Subunit: 388 residues, 4 copies
Amino acid sequence: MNYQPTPEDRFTFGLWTVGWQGRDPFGDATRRALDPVESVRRLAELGAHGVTFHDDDLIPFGSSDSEREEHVKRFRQALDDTGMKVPMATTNLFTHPVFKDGGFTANDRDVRRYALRKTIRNIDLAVELGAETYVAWGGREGAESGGAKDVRDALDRMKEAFDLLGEYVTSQGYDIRFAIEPKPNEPRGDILLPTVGHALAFIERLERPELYGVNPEVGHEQMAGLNFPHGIAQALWAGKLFHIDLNGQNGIKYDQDLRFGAGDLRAAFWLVDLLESAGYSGPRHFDFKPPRTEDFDGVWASAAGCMRNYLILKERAAAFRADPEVQEALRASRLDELARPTAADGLQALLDDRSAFEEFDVDAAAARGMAFERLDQLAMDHLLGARG
Amino acid sequence: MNYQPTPEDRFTFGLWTVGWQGRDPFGDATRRALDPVESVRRLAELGAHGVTFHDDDLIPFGSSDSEREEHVKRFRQALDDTGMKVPMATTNLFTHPVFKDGGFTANDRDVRRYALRKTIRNIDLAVELGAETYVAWGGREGAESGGAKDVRDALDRMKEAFDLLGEYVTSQGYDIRFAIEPKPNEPRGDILLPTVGHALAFIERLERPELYGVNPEVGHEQMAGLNFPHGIAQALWAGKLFHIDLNGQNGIKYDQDLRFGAGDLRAAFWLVDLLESAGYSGPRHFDFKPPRTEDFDGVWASAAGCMRNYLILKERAAAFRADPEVQEALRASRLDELARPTAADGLQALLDDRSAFEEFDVDAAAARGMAFERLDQLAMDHLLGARG
Amino acid sequence: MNYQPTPEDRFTFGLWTVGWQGRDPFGDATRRALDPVESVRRLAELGAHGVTFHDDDLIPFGSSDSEREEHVKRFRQALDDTGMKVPMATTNLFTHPVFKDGGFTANDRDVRRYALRKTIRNIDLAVELGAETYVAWGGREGAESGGAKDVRDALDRMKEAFDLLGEYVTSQGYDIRFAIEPKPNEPRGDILLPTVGHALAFIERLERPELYGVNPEVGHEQMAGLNFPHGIAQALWAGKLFHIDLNGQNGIKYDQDLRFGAGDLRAAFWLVDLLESAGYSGPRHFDFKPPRTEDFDGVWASAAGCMRNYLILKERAAAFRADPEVQEALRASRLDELARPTAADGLQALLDDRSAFEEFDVDAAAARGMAFERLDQLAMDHLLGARG
Amino acid sequence: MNYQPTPEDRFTFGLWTVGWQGRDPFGDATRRALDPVESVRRLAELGAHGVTFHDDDLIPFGSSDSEREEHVKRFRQALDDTGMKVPMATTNLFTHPVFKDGGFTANDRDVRRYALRKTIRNIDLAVELGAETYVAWGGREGAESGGAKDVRDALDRMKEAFDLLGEYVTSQGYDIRFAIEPKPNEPRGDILLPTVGHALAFIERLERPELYGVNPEVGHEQMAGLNFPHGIAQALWAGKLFHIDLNGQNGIKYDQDLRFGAGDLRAAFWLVDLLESAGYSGPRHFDFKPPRTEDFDGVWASAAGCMRNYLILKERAAAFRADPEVQEALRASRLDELARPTAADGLQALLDDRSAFEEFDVDAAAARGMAFERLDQLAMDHLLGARG
């Protein structure tokens, strides 16, 4: 009577997630390295729809052209053998010491050019393996101190970099779009474009804004104590939710990348509620790290859980929305009134309307309860499976 | 040998700041109410350039037309008697119980209309007393629970409201522009447009974006653990820093509104550094609360401090920038390289350049120190007055 | 097929909770004042076991002796009419302006004496109405700035105050014990004894430590980003959990006092799990505020929810613990090994044991998976009612 | 006219600080490994008083007895050649994969025994090289999920471990004491004894509490948003500040370990103020990481800065305390009254005193300003070197 995921649920996983070897700021790897081909096979057996990669996840840094060929072909045969897809890809511009002050916004001009060139090389690959989205996570763009980075110049260089990528893309006639992934900090003291809001606003300054959107991560917005569903709704309102990274985070601290459903469970529910009601049809991508306490059996247990919790949440939110008792409470709370225009009649009519000011009875309106706590308990009940 | 502010330094204060009576979530007022005319007189003696107001700060809620006249005239005579200006004004849409679920985004349609009408009434007043900026702080737009607010509808209503304001403004031919002030939370559990980034991005969806910018507050961005100078630089890059609210905050907790210079002192320094180097020429506005421990003597002490700390900071940052030893370190750290274009030569040339990839020596570039810690200690030394 | 609470579940509520009139830092009351007698009657109908009070909640500040009599008698008749008890009481030393720099640790000596005297007066009352626990929440003990409070002197005055209370208590031969409630901040910038840990440690310096324990609040520890069940377990290990305050909080920000089950739901589950397994038999006390959006109907809805969520949680945690599949996983994860002594054999034997160092195979032990993610998903499944 | 540190200032540094190779959760080392003997020599030239070590910092894990000899002797010759001391030492129980679920509180009994044995081996070494303090940082004691760790059992095992260490120590007749270092999180999701308060309270449950105190770190308390000087004062009041770790942290996020003076500058000032006024005579130990952006020249620049900022702070705080204008303001704010007993006259006299309640004029006392903002601006002025 369960929640088994199928490739139609569009669940994806990054190679670096289940492949995380468990090295952290204070300790060595607890797990041996996984061959990408094993990961593809194991995730498919679990019902994943596909996998995503960093260039250096697939092809080890410094690899020879003929080594590149080998890594790709082998990866290609695994994806052919399993039906798995590659909907998204990204570049690693944060691990190698050369990127210690950034990729696109490093102070050293020659480093910024190298970063562009390593990114462009990987977009051709990504296109080849059929990704539709290309993610950019500028984890090293930022600073630990105020004098080290002039942020107006850094944003000029960031825009310069995204504009060049967009020009490259259109000239090759590729179908791919870009998704910028925000993070407020870690590993830099502060990171540029630290939240969904910052990312959306930056995009509006680009040459061809239509090529760019956001890839928000649950844990990253929560590292700034923000409401993630609220941020996702602003991205949907803007037509910019191109991709999404799902995981768990317990409040404001280091980036935990726990399995989805872990961390803020109610946030999880409201997010699924929103993705499902808006009709989000992009990949459901997990960016998570199975804790370093675990062996390979716990890794696959943790990955399976990501998908299971999504499905359970999905069922509980459908039940909530469909419940006649909840639809009535939503009317009681005037959500229906929220969706009607405030002044369709227009400015002039508003100004002339005595019932909107001069004869508005503020005190009776003030007295009206919103009935939000009864509504939220109905949501609680539905989440916990305790309606009655 | 001091730091006395003058009206030319453009220091402003809200009526509600020095007038804060010290009521907080857990306690009654510790200070008696101040007459606006006394505040204008006292701030001018301290060297303030002007004052700002909420409608209900100036004219008590429910005031009769002929009472309105009285409050304004008296306020007018004080400003004539002192040379003080009114560069900014705003509406109170958060105190009255009718706004408990919001103003522009309340679920109740009739409340949203009332809010527009109370705002429009105050823009005419503001214009009359000569403000150039009209601030909007939607402190009650948001929610404590997920079902209570559909955020896509709420953003449709928020835009609807700002568009109507903009239409009103152009039709009256007024010279005023709008500044939206972000806050992540408090008094609502979560607030819509919670940071500078969110606010800038929303503005790009408005009918006439040129009429709107942001009024960021030091403490509000810091309630989300963000880097405030970094946020201010993004607002400057976007040409949207219309106004700014200065104060102090000690990390992530309730909105403290401490006097400017309190809270994160180094953040204070880097901010002044930035406003001064960008050539910000708007008002230097303090949104602060003298702690409720204080009597009227401590109130004026706390207001004088706001201005004093700005000036001290201003002197230390000029000294830093002007220091030949610092200019050399900035070169050492390649800030000069940050401000040059990455690929002025263009995409094609970048792709063809072997020195940007194929023959790029990553390891030598990796080996180059950024020299940021020596630079930051020089900044430290300058701040503390300990160069040597 | 529900979760109806009964007086045997020991659910209590403070007069100030359902009576909260909804005044917050930025807005007026949205609800009229409740007569304590109405609250007692309404909570009893909901199945509460009892109520708790601040002195000034029951008897308005400045009340005449003969007014005191009136308030008490009336309150007494309501408790007789309903079977409701008064297990806990406390003093208000934070609302009146005289306490603006604190009660027990105010800088002014005469204020500290007044605070003691107002507290002692209320302990006699509390005893009279039969409370067994007397809570102290020093919300005003602390500071906004470093020079204002010497913390070593303030702790000497705090101890002095608790020692005097303890002497008073023993000399009257009263049966009551003290519970100190920690809070990290708000309304002061920083508050003394900011967490459970600080409170427990302070208590060990008192004259008669056995008279004092802690009354931790869910939201307060979470305002410091701490793990509340973890803090509660340390209090239980110390034999100091005298009382507990239950509510909801969404991470690090202002003190929300949401209804219990709101905020961190998984934290809620693990807490109930712990109170239930340790055999906590004290009151289940809610310190919450029905949001100011609500009318009286939402108030009682919100209070009923506190109790309902506890019961649902209670059922899910019993189910988890009782599940044979979970008991096996706990063995898989070696929780059984955690509860056995490390070196019962003693130091000498440990030192001599070659299998503990010299011939310990670190690499095989390193290879052993902890199996925590499978265990946590079983916990997830149980919480959500989705075992299968 | 400078701030050159001397060995008499008692400045110490851990081998792992300047030796940090800059590997972080998202990137490889940017610096080559330093030989401990080079570090000792370089720090001495900078005026350090001594160095501290983890066992595995000095002697590489798995080292043969005869390799141990070699590492020690060489280290010994460097300390003889420079006059440098070793006031503190500690054990690494967090890096090796065997410690992934902890050292003293790992679920696996055999791991807990190994951890004790590796710790005891290093105490003999520490004693030999003359340390007086032995630090314990249980960075791996804790959990990512609720079921994984029963905290009451874990505290029983933690106590068991510290008691055994204490027994070992007394039986060998060693002069060394223990200092427990708290951290709220990272690398575990939550860490046991997460703050100074928790650590002090735990210690009171040990067999011989006099052997144990705390080694608080500036950044760790600030990761929980706490006031560090306030925590240090509670540790001093308790007579438990055995050692202290100095560094910088920018609010609530990952453990930054910035150079001392970085992060919260005003917190830095008030801390130095307190250590200096209490007469703290222990080592001034820096636990910091030169950012991975830096080369060896920036490493020594960053270490020199730690010491320089302490000295500058030290001078500014002495100036503040010594200033007649500040001594008067302190009287104005009644700090003198804070240090007098509240009721030396005793309970009975307090109860009988009509001036403490019955005839106490609350309203006049309420009216008295605390004058804290003038005092704090005088502190500001002194810090910035702008008195006038």
